[PDB]
Design an enzyme around this catalytic site. Sequence first.
Site, mmCIF file in Angstrom:
data_model
loop_
_atom_site.group_PDB
_atom_site.id
_atom_site.type_symbol
_atom_site.label_atom_id
_atom_site.label_comp_id
_atom_site.label_asym_id
_atom_site.label_seq_id
_atom_site.Cartn_x
_atom_site.Cartn_y
_atom_site.Cartn_z
ATOM 1 N N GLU A 51 -2.235 1.357 -5.011
ATOM 2 C CA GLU A 51 -1.014 1.723 -4.285
ATOM 3 C C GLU A 51 0.232 0.904 -4.566
ATOM 4 O OE1 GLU A 51 -3.927 0.665 -2.603
ATOM 5 O OE2 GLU A 51 -4.741 2.662 -2.121
ATOM 6 N N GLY B 256 -8.688 -6.171 -5.849
ATOM 7 C CA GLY B 256 -9.724 -6.734 -6.711
ATOM 8 C C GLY B 256 -9.115 -7.804 -7.614
ATOM 9 N N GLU C 5 -6.323 -2.013 6.957
ATOM 10 C CA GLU C 5 -5.277 -2.926 6.509
ATOM 11 C C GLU C 5 -4.149 -3.063 7.516
ATOM 12 O OE1 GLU C 5 -4.921 -1.014 2.707
ATOM 13 O OE2 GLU C 5 -5.940 -2.680 1.678
ATOM 14 N N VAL D 31 -11.917 0.113 -9.440
ATOM 15 C CA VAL D 31 -12.391 -0.539 -10.659
ATOM 16 C C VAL D 31 -13.622 -1.375 -10.334
ATOM 17 C CG1 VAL D 31 -11.783 -2.153 -12.522
ATOM 18 C CG2 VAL D 31 -10.124 -0.466 -11.712
ATOM 19 N N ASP E 135 -12.725 -8.540 -3.645
ATOM 20 C CA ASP E 135 -13.805 -8.348 -4.597
ATOM 21 C C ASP E 135 -13.312 -8.722 -5.991
ATOM 22 O OD1 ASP E 135 -12.978 -5.643 -6.150
ATOM 23 O OD2 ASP E 135 -12.548 -5.376 -4.016
HETATM 24 N N1 LIG Z 1 -11.865 -3.113 -7.378
HETATM 25 C C1 LIG Z 1 -10.813 -2.458 -6.830
HETATM 26 N N2 LIG Z 1 -10.251 -1.436 -7.529
HETATM 27 C C2 LIG Z 1 -9.203 -0.760 -7.028
HETATM 28 N N3 LIG Z 1 -8.649 -1.010 -5.842
HETATM 29 C C3 LIG Z 1 -9.191 -2.031 -5.118
HETATM 30 C C4 LIG Z 1 -8.807 -2.474 -3.861
HETATM 31 C C5 LIG Z 1 -7.670 -2.079 -2.935
HETATM 32 N N4 LIG Z 1 -7.728 -0.824 -2.168
HETATM 33 C C6 LIG Z 1 -8.979 -0.611 -1.411
HETATM 34 C C7 LIG Z 1 -9.230 0.884 -1.431
HETATM 35 C C8 LIG Z 1 -10.432 1.165 -2.320
HETATM 36 S S1 LIG Z 1 -11.130 2.752 -2.040
HETATM 37 C C9 LIG Z 1 -12.054 2.494 -0.545
HETATM 38 C C10 LIG Z 1 -12.797 3.732 -0.050
HETATM 39 C C11 LIG Z 1 -13.501 3.324 1.236
HETATM 40 C C12 LIG Z 1 -14.199 4.475 1.906
HETATM 41 C C13 LIG Z 1 -14.159 4.758 3.269
HETATM 42 N N5 LIG Z 1 -14.902 5.838 3.462
HETATM 43 C C14 LIG Z 1 -15.268 6.604 4.648
HETATM 44 C C15 LIG Z 1 -14.044 7.075 5.387
HETATM 45 C C16 LIG Z 1 -13.554 8.358 5.127
HETATM 46 C C17 LIG Z 1 -12.430 8.824 5.811
HETATM 47 C C18 LIG Z 1 -11.803 7.999 6.753
HETATM 48 C C19 LIG Z 1 -12.299 6.714 7.015
HETATM 49 C C20 LIG Z 1 -13.422 6.248 6.328
HETATM 50 N N6 LIG Z 1 -15.425 6.303 2.258
HETATM 51 N N7 LIG Z 1 -14.962 5.399 1.284
HETATM 52 C C21 LIG Z 1 -7.927 1.443 -2.003
HETATM 53 O O1 LIG Z 1 -6.950 1.652 -0.971
HETATM 54 C C22 LIG Z 1 -7.456 0.378 -2.973
HETATM 55 C C23 LIG Z 1 -9.677 -3.509 -3.569
HETATM 56 N N8 LIG Z 1 -10.547 -3.677 -4.592
HETATM 57 C C24 LIG Z 1 -10.264 -2.770 -5.574
#
Ligand SMILES: Nc1ncnc2c(CN3C[C@H](CSCCCc4cn(Cc5ccccc5)nn4)[C@@H](O)C3)c[nH]c12
EC number: 3.2.2.30
Lengths: 232, 232
Positions: free
Chosen positions: B177, B82, B15, B156, B200
């Site tokens: 956040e 989302g 981001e 979600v 999404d």
């Molecule tokens: N449907 C939804 N529900 C809730 N939140 C969201 C979002 C917005 N963001 C995005 C983010 C979601 S959590 C992403 C996890 C991604 C990830 C990345 N890695 C590997 C990794 C591990 C360490 C360092 C770098 C990569 N493993 N998982 C989190 O910051 C919230 C967008 N859509 C949403």
Amino acid sequence: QGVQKIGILGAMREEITPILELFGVDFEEIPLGGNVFHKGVYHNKEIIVAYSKIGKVHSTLTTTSMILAFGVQKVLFSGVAGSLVKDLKINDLLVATQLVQHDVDLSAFDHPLGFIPESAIFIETSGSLNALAKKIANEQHIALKEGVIASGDQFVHSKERKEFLVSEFKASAVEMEGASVAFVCQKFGVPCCVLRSISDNADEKAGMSFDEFLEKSAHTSAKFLKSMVDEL
Amino acid sequence: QGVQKIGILGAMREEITPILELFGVDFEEIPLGGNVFHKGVYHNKEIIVAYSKIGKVHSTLTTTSMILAFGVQKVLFSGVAGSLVKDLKINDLLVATQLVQHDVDLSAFDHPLGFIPESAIFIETSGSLNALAKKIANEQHIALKEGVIASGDQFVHSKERKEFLVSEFKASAVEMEGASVAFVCQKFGVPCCVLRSISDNADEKAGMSFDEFLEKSAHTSAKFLKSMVDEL
Ligand SMILES: Nc1ncnc2c(CN3C[C@H](CSCCCc4cn(Cc5ccccc5)nn4)[C@@H](O)C3)c[nH]c12
Ligand SMILES: Nc1ncnc2c(CN3C[C@H](CSCCCc4cn(Cc5ccccc5)nn4)[C@@H](O)C3)c[nH]c12
């Protein structure tokens, strides 16, 4: 050396009322970031006492303020918690050896519950402070248990959620702030100890038990925290 | 007057990558509290850019550090979210007028969902900054929607949870956040704007959609945030 600065935190006003009373010194009240910090001197130590307000965001903010604005070198948390295990009874004391954010769920990306990328499921507290707590408890013939504390932004009051916390995290007690406090301390390299006294059994009657035992359990934790500060 | 200090936050590295690139200035990297702050100068303004890491505790910590350690006078958040509503499509921009912590549950004490004592269900953002966003969007013929954003410590990805967020909070988008960022800013009296671009639909396919659209949606939000900074 320099004067030792110790941060002392509760979540609710009721958790710090006995702390302020037991230390029995004059405090300067300093407002910052929606909190009131009580700054006093006690045995060559500067003590900074505050309640964060309830939950993970409140406690994260207040702990960060303590560290950045007040320069604390250690953080001791005192308050109450729900018991998840038969051997932790109302009024019993627990020191948290690890903590988890039990409501974190990134399972859509195949992460285990509690896990966030660039962090860990379990957050450690200070071995030296936890050793001190155990030493003092043994000298005073106080039962002190140790174990995992689960923290989340829900008041837990169901058999079903209790059993999840035990099965998923092997947690012994539940509350809404310890993991966030310990997390902030870990990020800043600040020694942290989280103490809790049991107020309820995190079941369907937990609200009524909490209201009945908050005062007594808060005092029990506060008294023990003071005994730790006396050895720092 | 003094040089204006502006905090610019994302949750994930992805981001802030487009933010750093679009501003196109030299940044000093400063480590603090497990975050890296990128400090640069842009048009008589000092810009401090960081990603917090995912979720409510991470973002609360980083926002508090920005305010206390870097002295920012405004905080602008840019990232992805989302969609909870049919009219918010992939890549669409939303400015949050209020935010809620959707996973807060003190209903055992008859509190409404989202509510914590000594706080409120809904946290407001800056009217003047939200007005600026709307003015710029209208000048550039950019569809900018406004509405409630729900934040929690879960990704979600279910019809059932989406519908709860709409019914309970009248939320338009979901993320992990915004509410914590806006909350910290409110506590310190710091103007806050939260911008999100849709990645999404917060449904059963949300993980795959997120992976596909993170880069593009992050860039869309970043570009708009830069256009706001150009008017400060
Ligand atoms: N449907 C939804 N529900 C809730 N939140 C969201 C979002 C917005 N963001 C995005 C983010 C979601 S959590 C992403 C996890 C991604 C990830 C990345 N890695 C590997 C990794 C591990 C360490 C360092 C770098 C990569 N493993 N998982 C989190 O910051 C919230 C967008 N859509 C949403
Ligand atoms: N079963 C359990 N599950 C989760 N956590 C716990 C705890 C530990 N504490 C206690 C506290 C729980 S939330 C208490 C809310 C009390 C209250 C107080 N008021 C009125 C009020 C409002 C504003 C200011 C002062 C009072 N309305 N509700 C919260 O700080 C977590 C102990 N048992 C737990």
